[PDB]
Design a protein around this nucleic acid. Structure first.
Ligand SMILES: Nc1ccn([C@H]2C[C@H](O)[C@@H](COP(=O)(O)OP(=O)(O)OP(=O)(O)O)O2)c(=O)n1
Ligand SMILES: [Mg+2]
Ligand SMILES: [Mg+2]
Ligand SMILES: [Mg+2]
Ligand SMILES: [Mg+2]
Length: 435
DNA sequence: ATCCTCCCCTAC
DNA sequence: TAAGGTAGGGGAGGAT
């Protein structure tokens, strides 16, 4: 049953989990705006970024001292690095497409399970988060596989924020294992050097989780995030003002928060690889080429300038639910049955968050023409494109029968081969809170 | 100029 | 096998 299929997918999805945890930690921090750790150590803006090292791995091997110091990966694959042969799939074509259009603008039995997190040992060999386990185990035959433990990560994630909250409420939740903290007040009250405090928080986090955090310190958010890169693993790095200009010039532009593979490829065609190359670009040229806001962001960031305060309050703008894995329909009756289920799921989330929406958007992934019907990854969406529809209701609703019905009307206007469908997503906008 | 609407992109 | 989600920023381009 599609009802059990949905529940079962979300049950096993790490990406669904990290998103929920982020949502929860964000709400916890918001709450704090409506300190045992400071007094227990009471015995020019300053920003600290706290980021746990190889978070799933570290938690996974907490109580497994045989795996410390080894190449380890958190993945679904039991450990062989093999999967059943998939004849008619074309891993080569999908990988080329991934390197060409996506990373820019025996193979047949290898595991295509993703590595969620890998140890630093494993990294010293090119294994990175998001690599297929089959391939990783080719780069490093001694890669150790470790199962997910979602309960344990949620517990460490919470312990992490509780700990930071014990020093200050001036926190921004970046993710489940990562927060920004403004420590200007603490340093003034305790009279401690930024480094002394950073060490203290690290010692305490390790004490309470058996997991290591790296800390980056700087006079703004951008600079604190970048210092963390240099701090990892198990360390800290204070990027002082006198070092900013020389540190920044050598950084690959891709390291700037907000520059991914698409922006990188567009900059490389401008002849720009490092932040230093970028500094030579005018504000007017960056805005013309990239738009006003992105243009300005690039100009400022490549200089180490950033004036965003720590955002302690975040308001929810949308609720959604997508599954782009294990979607295979043959009949329009099956697809419409599934749309009505995801509609009950979207009702639960709107309720759980106490919202109703006016604007409803259906997004379908469809197999791309020329792309093989048999996916390289078991259950994968493979190479696809997106069809999207949007409607707007007269009243904000949270009723699945109305949402379901809206999804069926939207789905009918699509020109679609059911057997090419590879993913479905419902997105709710223009929210209003209940009561 | 500001405001819509339909997307692409990015972070984790 | 394997579980490729989720929210928000913002550009293009068009109507107001
Ligand atoms: N491709 C990815 C990236 C991240 N996450 C999960 C696994 C990570 O353990 C956790 C935190 O991600 P980070 O980006 O902080 O990376 P790590 O903590 O694993 O390593 P690092 O030490 O580089 O921060 O989120 C995931 O499921 N899949
Ligand atoms: Mg981390
Ligand atoms: Mg996996
Ligand atoms: Mg992280
Ligand atoms: Mg970047």
């Amino acid at each position: 049953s599609d009802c059990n299929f949905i529940s079962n997918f979300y049950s096993h999805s790490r990406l669904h989990h990290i998103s929920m945890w982020k949502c929860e930690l964000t709400e916890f921090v918001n709450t704090l705006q409506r300190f045992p750790g400071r007094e227990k150590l009471k015995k020019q803006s300053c920003i600290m970024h706290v980021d746990m090292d190889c978070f799933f791995v570290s938690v996974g091997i907490r109580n497994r001292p045989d795996l410390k110091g080894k190449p380890v990966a958190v993945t679904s694959n039991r450990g062989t690095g093999r999967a059943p042969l998939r004849p008619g799939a074309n891993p080569q074509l999908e990988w080329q497409y991934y390197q060409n259009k996506i990373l820019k603008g025996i193979d047949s039995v290898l595991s295509r399970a993703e590595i969620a997190s890998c140890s630093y040992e494993a990294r010293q060999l090119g294994i990175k988060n998001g690599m297929f386990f089959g391939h990783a185990k080719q780069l490093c035959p001694n890669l150790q596989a470790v199962p997910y433990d979602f309960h344990a990560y949620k517990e460490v994630a919470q312990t992490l924020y509780e700990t930071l909250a014990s020093y200050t409420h001036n926190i921004e939740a970046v993710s489940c294992d990562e927060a920004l903290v403004d420590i200007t007040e603490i340093l003034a009250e305790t009279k401690l050097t930024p480094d002394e405090f950073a060490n203290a928080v690290r010692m305490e986090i390790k004490d309470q989780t058996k997991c290591a955090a790296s800390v980056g310190i700087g006079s703004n958010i951008l600079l604190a995030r970048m210092a963390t890169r240099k701090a990892k693993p198990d360390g800290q790095y204070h990027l002082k003002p006198e070092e900013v200009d020389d540190f920044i010039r050598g950084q690959l532009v891709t390291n700037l928060p907000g520059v991914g593979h698409s922006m990188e490829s567009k900059l490389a065609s401008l002849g720009i690889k490092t932040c230093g190359d970028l500094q030579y670009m005018t504000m007017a040229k960056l805005q013309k080429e990239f738009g006003p806001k992105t243009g300005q962001m690039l100009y400022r960031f490549c200089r180490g300038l950033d004036d965003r305060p720590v955002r302690t309050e975040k308001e929810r703008k949308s609720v959604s639910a997508e599954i782009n894995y294990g979607i295979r329909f043959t009949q329009p009756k099956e697809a419409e049955a599934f749309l009505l289920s995801l509609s009950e799921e979207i009702q639960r989330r709107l309720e759980a968050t106490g919202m109703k929406g006016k604007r409803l958007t259906l997004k379908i992934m469809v197999r791309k023409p020329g792309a093989p019907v048999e996916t390289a990854k078991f259950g994968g969406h493979g190479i696809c494109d997106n069809i999207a529809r949007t409607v707007t209701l007269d009243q904000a609703t949270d009723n699945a029968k109305i949402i379901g019905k809206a999804m069926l009307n939207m789905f009918h206007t699509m020109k679609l081969n059911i057997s090419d469908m590879r993913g479905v997503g419902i997105h709710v906008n223009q929210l209003v809170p209940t009561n």
